[PDB]
Amino acid sequence: EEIEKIVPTYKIGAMELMTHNICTSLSTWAKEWKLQYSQDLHKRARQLLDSLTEQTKMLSTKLSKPVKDIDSLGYVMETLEQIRKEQAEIDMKFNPVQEMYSLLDNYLPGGITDKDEMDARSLLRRNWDILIQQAEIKGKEYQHK
Amino acid sequence: QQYKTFMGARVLWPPECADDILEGAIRETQDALKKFEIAREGQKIAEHLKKYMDDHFDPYWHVFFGKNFGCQAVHNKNRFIYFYIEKTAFLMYQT
Amino acid sequence: KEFNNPINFQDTETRYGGIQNQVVNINQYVQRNPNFIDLDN
Amino acid sequence: LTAQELNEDMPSKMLEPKNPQAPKNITVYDYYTRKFKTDELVDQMIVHFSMDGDYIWKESNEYKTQEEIRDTKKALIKEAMRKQESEEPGANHDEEAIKQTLRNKFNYNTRECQTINPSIRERGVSTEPPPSDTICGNITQWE
Amino acid sequence: RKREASLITLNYIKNRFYPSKIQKIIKELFEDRLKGVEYDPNNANQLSERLVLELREKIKRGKVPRYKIGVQVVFGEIKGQGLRIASKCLWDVQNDNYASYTYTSEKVYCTGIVFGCYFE
Amino acid sequence: HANEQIIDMPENSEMKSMKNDAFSQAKFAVENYKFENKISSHIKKFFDEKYGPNWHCVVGKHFNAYVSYDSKNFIFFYEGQLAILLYRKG
Amino acid sequence: MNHEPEVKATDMEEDMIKRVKEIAINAVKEYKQEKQIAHYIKYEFDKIDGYGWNCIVGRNFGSHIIHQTKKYIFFKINELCLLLWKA
Amino acid sequence: TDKEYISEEVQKAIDDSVKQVFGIKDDSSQVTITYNKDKVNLWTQQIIDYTIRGLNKLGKHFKYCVTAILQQTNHAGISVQITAYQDTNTDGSLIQCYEINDIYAIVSVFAMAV
Amino acid sequence: MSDSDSDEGRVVEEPLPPHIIRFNDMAQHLLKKVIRQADVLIKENPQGLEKDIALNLVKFVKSQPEFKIGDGEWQCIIGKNFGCSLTFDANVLAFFDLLPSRKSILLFKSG
Amino acid sequence: MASEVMNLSEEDIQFCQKAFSDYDEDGLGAIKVSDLKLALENIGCSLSENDLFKMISEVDEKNTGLIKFSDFLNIYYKQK
């Protein structure tokens, strides 16, 4: 905004000063400095999404085990216990991850990441809902089991 | 709307705040003004009063004092105190 | 004229209050296996 | 609800049943309403001490519900103890052990849930109106 | 402040803070008199009345001579039994105030209610 | 002319409208109501429906106040001559 | 206007989850008090789901409580969090 | 007499409140009331309304203060002591103990000169 | 046997953190033990998620021997502001708020 | 009641000069007009707004009493 409102010229009693040449260089320099923060923020934001997708990916693999044997019966219960804690915790951590993605996109001119990142976020939300439904079905099946 | 004077300070005659707490708050505000004037560095005196309320009363107290202002707020039962000292009105509601 | 309070007002009278005794058990079972209490913070 | 007449024609005043100390109005936000709700009318009743206790009299309606809860828990415990005793040969498992044994990782799942809370912050803001100056103007026909 | 002077004429009031000043005084007095929390015997019931008599004198000492003080002290044994006590008193609104302090020990609960009415 | 204001609201987190709504609501409410007490009630009511309860806003031409507010829920701006302060606590 | 609540995480049947949401909408409008809303949900659920039930409504809170499998549902309404579990 | 506190008048006012809430009095009465957490809160407020209204109907120019305590079906030791600071000629304080089947309650009335 | 004063104290030895009890339907010995653990746990992780603090507290009460009243599994919910009504085992519910922390702590067993 | 305080004399004296100048009346009191009399006689400031500014900033003001003297005591410190 300062660069936006900086006077385009100054004057004294007998001299004029052009202020536009410095301003053009400063605007490019300011954008590059802001770009570095957005790129650094993008790395931090992207890691949370990868960890969240892998966490959700990990829970799906635990649910996938057949658990035919008695030893396997406990493992499904352990994942269900993990799902409860993770389910409550993920909603709390979901808000910050969503805010970071929105803030980073607004401050970064370049595409994030674009369609691949949007698709990944949508897929993660759908996967979490599917996992909760799968866990309830698994529990009824397991009571008969 | 009926203002009343107590302990040298003009405040609502029916006191929203508790009688014990209200008297203490009025005395503390008068002592603070005696030391720091409202006209110069007025922001500092308001901050000092807010910290003082947390030490002797339930936390998250909200303090707003101005010569002329209008406000409506939601406060806990017996946690709202409004009084006028000279030409300045001080309103504090505990949340 | 208007109200005044010069007349002495120094007398205090105290009356005792009590409940007649009965067997403590009174055909009742102390507590319950599960107790329900509502607490507001 | 009576009015007492003050002597020598003083401004009239009356006493009221309502307790003055109790808050003038109580307001509770309603999610369904979606806006703050204020109720001028209040209970206006003061209790020095309030005590709630788990004391029940014989053949009470509440007592019958308590008996059903004990019987249902006992029936599950009895079935669990009998089934384990029936399944095993000469099972010596204690009733307390069977109750502990009845609980299972699949049988009981514990999940910890918390609500995100914004960190409380303290900020001081001071507003002071634009400076005003005194101006004196004299106008004459010649000027 | 002619109206303020006029307000003194209809009722002097002498509205000294009574909401917590009496409550702070009664709370301090109750802890010392209560002594051991465990004692709750039949002989102690007679002793409970003695505590109430001492409490009324202290209220007069704490800037309450002009006001008339009514104080009720209830001593009971709590074994999980539930009892709620509510007191309602008709007084000139904002001309009178009352202080109530409740102290509960592991096996003994003591509640003191003090009522002050302006008189002249 | 609102030369200096304090802005503490989330950006690009889908809560961007809260800052926009506060500026728009203050201009519309202040002109029609034309009362300091009324402006605080109207601004608080509109914000309460959209973003939930526990919102306190005080409007005064000249005033000094210190308060504790939830992070990213406090915005201070000047609507014309009048100054309006709105924040969420609890 | 109050929109249908969104559940962050739950362990309930398709028929059962609809009943909890239906009960939740009626309870919020009926009682202004937060404690009253929690009290209404537990009593209504007692007839449908039996003697053991628990209901907690907190604007901001975090806790883990053991619950019977398929009897735990947590749903958050706009600006409010309600948690109910069985045994 | 006409404007003088009477112990007998105060007792009848408390009796009317107890009868009004649940008393059909001795014979030709079929009332069985059991103390409940929800019911006890309603009873204290309702009993206070009747005692104040009952006292007020025949009431003189006297400041009236009423305190109501409900015992949880006895089974504990509770003693209530009442101390009143008032001119003896001007006012008198009466405490009444009531036995009402399952729930036992105590009503205290304070008289202040006006 | 102790610094400054010999043989310490029966009262001097045990110090309790400041707290407010909304309701205390539990044995005094059990409540005192829970309050000391809760104060230490909050001190260990100040300005931390309530759920994380609750999980550690639930483990500590369950782990200690002779602190089990039986019936329902021990479960504690901690929230700065919350309203609830839960059926609980008789004399198994403790409710308290730490004055410095200013966060209400609820511990009870439901069957 | 002083307590070991040197302080400047040049200014401390000036105040007394202008003070007794208008206060020569020996009324024992000071008004809001007298304070300006001095600056009005010599022409220190352009308008009363100046003196009123600093003075007003001090704390408050009224009609007339004696504390008005502060105007001079502080006036010397606004010369800069």
Side-chain angles (χ1 to χ4, degrees), chain A residues 1-112 114-145, chain B, chain C, chain D, chain E, chain F, chain G, chain H residues 5-23 37-88 90-114, chain I residues 9 11-111, chain J residues 2 19 27 29-30 39 44 65:
Chain A
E1 288 185 4
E2 296 179 358
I3 302 185
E4 175 185 3
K5 306 174 183 179
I6 191 171
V7 173
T9 184
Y10 298 89
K11 293 182 181 178
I12 61 170
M15 297 180 74
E16 295 183 357
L17 299 175
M18 296 297 288
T19 60
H20 164 88
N21 289 337
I22 266 178
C23 184
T24 303
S25 300
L26 288 181
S27 301
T28 299
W29 202 56
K31 288 181 181 180
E32 291 303 0
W33 291 95
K34 99 170 185 59
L35 268 151
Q36 297 303 350
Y37 259 105
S38 295
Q39 291 184 1
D40 289 358
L41 182 169
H42 162 113
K43 298 180 180 180
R44 185 176 179 83
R46 199 193 184 99
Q47 282 194 10
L48 292 189
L49 261 189
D50 282 349
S51 73
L52 282 188
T53 49
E54 288 197 9
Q55 168 177 345
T56 75
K57 209 304 178 182
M58 188 74 175
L59 297 308
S60 288
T61 59
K62 289 189 174 182
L63 287 187
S64 80
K65 280 187 174 184
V67 181
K68 305 177 181 180
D69 300 351
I70 294 169
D71 314 0
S72 172
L73 251 57
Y75 202 61
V76 157
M77 309 296 66
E78 276 201 10
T79 39
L80 267 277
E81 288 195 3
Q82 181 170 343
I83 282 188
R84 293 178 179 83
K85 297 177 183 178
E86 289 192 11
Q87 174 192 51
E89 288 167 4
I90 197 178
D91 187 350
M92 293 292 301
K93 187 153 191 174
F94 259 142
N95 183 7
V97 173
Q98 289 163 342
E99 289 190 358
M100 276 297 305
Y101 173 100
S102 177
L103 189 176
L104 175 164
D105 181 6
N106 185 6
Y107 277 79
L108 288 192
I112 58 192
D114 295 340
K115 300 180 180 180
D116 304 2
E117 252 309 12
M118 279 297 302
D119 288 3
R121 191 176 188 269
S122 58
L123 281 176
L124 182 170
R125 192 63 177 182
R126 194 166 187 175
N127 283 5
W128 194 244
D129 182 357
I130 289 179
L131 182 170
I132 305 178
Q133 304 177 2
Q134 173 186 0
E136 298 185 4
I137 302 302
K138 278 295 183 178
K140 303 178 181 180
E141 290 178 1
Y142 264 77
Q143 299 177 358
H144 294 282
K145 280 190 176 183
Chain B
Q1 181 177 348
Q2 175 180 357
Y3 287 95
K4 188 58 178 299
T5 75
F6 97 53
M7 205 161 190
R10 188 159 177 250
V11 82
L12 200 50
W13 178 212
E16 295 302 320
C17 183
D19 289 345
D20 170 11
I21 298 179
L22 175 166
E23 183 178 2
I26 289 188
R27 199 50 194 176
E28 196 49 4
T29 58
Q30 280 177 143
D31 286 354
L33 295 174
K34 200 71 175 60
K35 181 55 180 180
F36 328 104
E37 316 68 354
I38 293 183
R40 57 194 304 176
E41 305 173 352
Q43 152 50 3
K44 176 202 310 175
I45 196 187
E47 180 182 341
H48 155 105
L49 182 57
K50 182 290 189 306
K51 279 184 175 56
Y52 163 87
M53 290 306 171
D54 294 3
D55 294 355
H56 308 106
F57 294 113
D58 295 351
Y60 306 91
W61 259 106
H62 291 260
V63 166
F64 274 74
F65 59 88
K67 307 191 63 177
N68 161 25
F69 77 83
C71 183
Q72 177 188 7
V74 175
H75 55 78
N76 300 295
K77 306 189 310 177
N78 289 337
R79 289 307 176 263
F80 176 98
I81 313 179
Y82 181 54
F83 68 90
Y84 259 96
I85 61 171
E86 303 307 4
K87 175 46 185 180
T88 60
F90 290 53
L91 177 63
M92 30 197 178
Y93 51 91
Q94 182 275 5
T95 298
Chain C
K1 266 196 172 182
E2 298 186 353
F3 52 66
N4 283 322
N5 174 10
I7 197 173
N8 64 34
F9 167 71
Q10 188 192 7
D11 291 323
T12 58
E13 305 155 348
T14 80
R15 180 160 295 88
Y16 45 114
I19 73 80
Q20 304 197 199
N21 257 0
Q22 202 189 3
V23 169
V24 285
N25 185 44
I26 210 193
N27 289 337
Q28 293 177 335
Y29 317 125
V30 60
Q31 301 173 347
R32 291 193 297 274
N33 177 358
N35 175 357
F36 296 97
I37 283 298
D38 309 347
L39 302 180
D40 177 1
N41 184 24
Chain D
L1 195 275
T2 64
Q4 62 186 178
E5 53 185 357
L6 305 306
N7 203 340
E8 295 302 320
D9 299 6
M10 291 199 203
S12 66
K13 67 178 178 180
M14 63 176 300
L15 59 174
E16 294 181 3
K18 64 175 58 182
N19 157 232
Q21 189 185 25
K24 176 56 181 181
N25 68 342
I26 298 181
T27 71
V28 174
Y29 180 59
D30 274 342
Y31 295 68
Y32 176 77
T33 309
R34 188 57 177 178
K35 62 175 292 182
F36 258 110
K37 178 175 182 295
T38 178
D39 294 353
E40 167 55 343
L41 183 158
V42 306
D43 299 3
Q44 216 142 12
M45 189 173 183
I46 73 84
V47 59
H48 297 165
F49 192 59
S50 60
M51 210 168 187
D52 294 347
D54 186 33
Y55 233 86
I56 310 299
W57 58 273
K58 184 183 306 178
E59 288 194 10
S60 97
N61 177 4
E62 292 171 317
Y63 184 86
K64 297 180 179 180
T65 79
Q66 171 191 338
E67 272 202 346
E68 181 56 344
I69 301 175
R70 277 188 169 181
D71 293 9
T72 49
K73 290 182 182 177
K74 168 173 289 59
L76 296 178
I77 290 178
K78 183 176 184 179
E79 284 191 5
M81 167 161 186
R82 264 215 155 198
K83 283 189 175 184
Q84 184 173 198
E85 183 178 2
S86 182
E87 284 163 352
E88 206 181 355
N92 184 22
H93 289 271
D94 294 348
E95 292 203 6
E96 182 185 13
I98 293 151
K99 291 178 50 54
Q100 191 287 343
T101 299
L102 177 166
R103 294 186 181 181
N104 296 308
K105 201 69 174 184
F106 41 109
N107 178 11
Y108 274 123
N109 193 336
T110 53
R111 298 172 173 177
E112 36 213 16
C113 164
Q114 86 168 185
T115 62
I116 315 176
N117 289 160
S119 313
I120 74 76
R121 189 76 65 88
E122 54 189 14
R123 193 182 198 86
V125 174
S126 62
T127 58
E128 292 177 350
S132 300
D133 289 314
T134 169
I135 193 180
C136 302
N138 60 338
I139 200 57
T140 55
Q141 197 63 3
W142 60 271
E143 188 168 354
Chain E
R1 302 178 182 178
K2 288 191 175 183
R3 258 292 167 264
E4 178 47 8
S6 183
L7 194 170
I8 302 183
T9 81
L10 62 80
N11 42 30
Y12 264 83
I13 294 169
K14 279 49 184 58
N15 192 31
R16 329 296 285 274
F17 309 91
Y18 187 108
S20 172
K21 181 190 297 182
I22 301 302
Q23 187 275 5
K24 185 180 64 178
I25 289 301
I26 64 179
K27 157 180 179 298
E28 180 179 1
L29 172 49
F30 264 118
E31 303 166 355
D32 305 6
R33 297 294 181 192
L34 266 28
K35 294 184 179 181
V37 290
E38 308 173 10
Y39 287 97
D40 204 332
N42 289 337
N43 290 1
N45 159 25
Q46 172 188 354
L47 293 183
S48 77
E49 169 285 337
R50 181 177 65 83
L51 177 63
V52 199
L53 156 52
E54 188 58 7
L55 182 61
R56 78 159 189 261
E57 162 55 334
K58 197 162 304 309
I59 307 300
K60 172 289 179 179
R61 174 169 302 279
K63 312 178 186 306
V64 192
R66 180 55 151 271
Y67 273 102
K68 276 49 184 180
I69 308 76
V71 51
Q72 173 184 355
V73 169
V74 51
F75 171 99
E77 177 181 0
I78 61 89
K79 290 197 320 327
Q81 147 205 14
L83 77 78
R84 201 186 78 92
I85 297 182
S87 58
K88 203 169 189 180
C89 165
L90 192 297
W91 63 57
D92 285 30
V93 176
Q94 307 173 11
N95 300 355
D96 302 305
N97 192 31
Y98 78 87
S100 61
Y101 173 81
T102 181
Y103 176 77
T104 62
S105 79
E106 175 186 354
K107 198 68 174 184
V108 166
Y109 95 110
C110 283
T111 294
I113 184 60
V114 175
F115 294 104
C117 312
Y118 159 79
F119 191 84
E120 181 163 5
Chain F
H1 284 277
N3 309 353
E4 175 63 17
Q5 327 90 340
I6 293 179
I7 300 182
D8 180 350
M9 302 297 298
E11 286 192 1
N12 290 350
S13 73
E14 293 177 350
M15 296 323 314
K16 183 178 179 180
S17 70
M18 279 188 180
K19 195 196 74 58
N20 299 1
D21 283 323
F23 279 105
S24 176
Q25 274 303 328
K27 176 290 177 183
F28 166 96
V30 157
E31 176 54 359
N32 305 359
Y33 285 58
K34 186 177 186 61
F35 210 47
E36 291 54 23
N37 173 8
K38 279 188 173 181
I39 289 335
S40 291
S41 69
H42 176 105
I43 295 180
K44 176 182 179 303
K45 286 175 186 59
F46 170 94
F47 263 96
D48 275 354
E49 301 184 6
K50 196 162 189 180
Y51 316 113
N54 292 359
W55 278 78
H56 320 122
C57 78
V58 169
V59 175
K61 305 178 178 302
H62 148 101
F63 68 96
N64 281 355
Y66 198 62
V67 80
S68 66
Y69 56 74
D70 300 6
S71 44
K72 306 173 299 182
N73 296 325
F74 177 80
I75 187 186
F76 173 85
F77 59 57
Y78 278 83
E79 197 292 335
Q81 289 59 17
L82 188 48
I84 297 180
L85 177 63
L86 72 77
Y87 51 93
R88 170 219 293 269
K89 164 53 186 178
Chain G
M1 178 183 182
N2 174 34
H3 56 282
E4 290 192 10
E6 62 179 5
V7 296
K8 300 310 176 181
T10 59
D11 167 11
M12 272 267 167
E13 307 175 349
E14 295 64 3
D15 305 8
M16 273 301 308
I17 190 181
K18 295 177 183 177
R19 292 290 192 279
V20 190
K21 283 169 56 296
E22 151 197 4
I23 295 286
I25 292 184
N26 299 350
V28 170
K29 66 180 181 181
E30 185 165 336
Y31 308 88
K32 291 60 180 180
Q33 292 294 354
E34 304 278 342
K35 64 164 193 174
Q36 292 181 11
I37 298 177
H39 176 113
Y40 174 91
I41 305 287
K42 197 184 72 62
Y43 267 93
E44 297 310 44
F45 269 100
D46 277 8
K47 292 175 296 304
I48 182 179
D49 289 345
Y51 40 99
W53 212 255
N54 283 312
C55 295
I56 288 186
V57 177
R59 208 178 188 291
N60 77 83
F61 68 115
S63 162
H64 92 277
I65 309 164
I66 297 183
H67 66 77
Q68 174 166 336
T69 316
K70 293 180 178 180
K71 295 315 173 183
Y72 169 110
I73 186 167
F74 169 108
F75 58 87
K76 168 184 178 181
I77 212 171
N78 65 331
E79 304 308 4
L80 166 157
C81 307
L82 184 164
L83 159 54
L84 80 75
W85 72 100
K86 176 173 191 301
Chain H
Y5 176 77
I6 311 188
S7 69
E8 306 170 9
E9 273 194 10
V10 173
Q11 288 182 7
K12 282 182 181 180
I14 318 178
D15 289 345
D16 289 0
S17 78
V18 159
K19 275 200 173 188
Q20 276 304 3
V21 58
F22 59 88
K37 46 188 176 63
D38 301 3
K39 274 196 173 181
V40 151
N41 178 348
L42 171 50
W43 272 330
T44 60
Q45 186 176 12
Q46 192 181 6
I47 284 180
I48 286 177
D49 272 45
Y50 289 125
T51 59
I52 295 186
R53 186 209 62 173
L55 278 165
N56 184 0
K57 185 180 57 57
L58 176 42
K60 342 279 190 175
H61 316 278
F62 276 130
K63 282 195 172 184
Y64 272 104
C65 301
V66 178
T67 56
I69 314 175
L70 314 190
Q71 202 168 343
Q72 181 43 15
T73 84
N74 65 58
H75 180 56
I78 184 184
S79 295
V80 174
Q81 289 298 4
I82 177 179
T83 61
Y85 206 55
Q86 173 51 318
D87 263 9
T88 45
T90 73
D91 291 281
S93 60
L94 263 185
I95 294 169
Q96 199 58 6
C97 293
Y98 280 105
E99 318 162 354
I100 301 150
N101 218 323
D102 299 331
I103 181 182
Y104 284 78
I106 293 185
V107 179
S108 59
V109 175
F110 288 93
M112 322 282 292
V114 130
Chain I
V11 175
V12 175
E13 295 177 350
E14 298 180 352
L16 180 51
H19 68 274
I20 308 298
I21 305 273
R22 314 282 183 174
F23 194 66
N24 176 24
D25 201 13
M26 202 187 274
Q28 280 303 177
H29 297 259
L30 308 180
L31 180 74
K32 292 169 55 183
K33 199 149 46 186
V34 159
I35 295 179
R36 298 188 188 89
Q37 165 57 27
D39 170 36
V40 170
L41 198 47
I42 297 192
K43 183 182 179 182
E44 286 188 7
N45 52 26
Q47 294 178 352
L49 292 297
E50 308 168 8
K51 165 279 183 179
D52 174 2
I53 292 184
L55 184 171
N56 285 351
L57 177 39
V58 169
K59 170 183 297 57
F60 167 100
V61 285
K62 184 178 179 179
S63 298
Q64 281 196 146
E66 103 192 355
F67 184 83
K68 315 170 181 179
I69 305 182
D71 298 16
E73 298 269 349
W74 274 88
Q75 50 190 171
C76 183
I77 309 73
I78 302 179
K80 293 190 61 179
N81 186 340
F82 69 91
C84 49
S85 69
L86 298 317
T87 64
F88 54 76
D89 183 1
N91 291 358
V92 192
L93 159 59
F95 177 80
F96 56 95
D97 180 357
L98 308 188
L99 189 57
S101 298
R102 293 182 183 174
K103 295 167 51 184
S104 40
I105 294 184
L106 171 76
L107 183 55
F108 67 83
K109 291 174 65 175
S110 62

